[PDB]
Subunit: 24 residues, 4 copies
């Protein structure tokens, strides 16, 4: 319910996805 | 209200900004 | 909240992968 | 939530390491 925590959550998922794609 | 969780949220957003700027 | 919990697990995985990537 | 707290600690470490790796 903290918009900062929910947003950082979504963004942290986004970040790891981008890292894996660049690693593959 | 947990400063640890709030700070890591802020930091995780900054980290993705830095990652994308290195990518761009 | 399962999104926060999911991001938590994912962030832990990310640092492990990044560390191994530089190891 | 100890999981979210653990992942908060790790996320802060992660960026510390990432910046030092670039310096
Ligand atoms: C970005 C990631 N380290 C997160 C971001 C937010 C704060 C912390 C838990 C969860 C949501 C994941 C740490
Ligand atoms: Cl990287």
């Amino acid at each position: 319910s903290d918009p900062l925590v929910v947003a950082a959550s979504i963004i942290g998922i986004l970040h790891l996805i981008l890292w894996i794609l660049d690693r593959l």
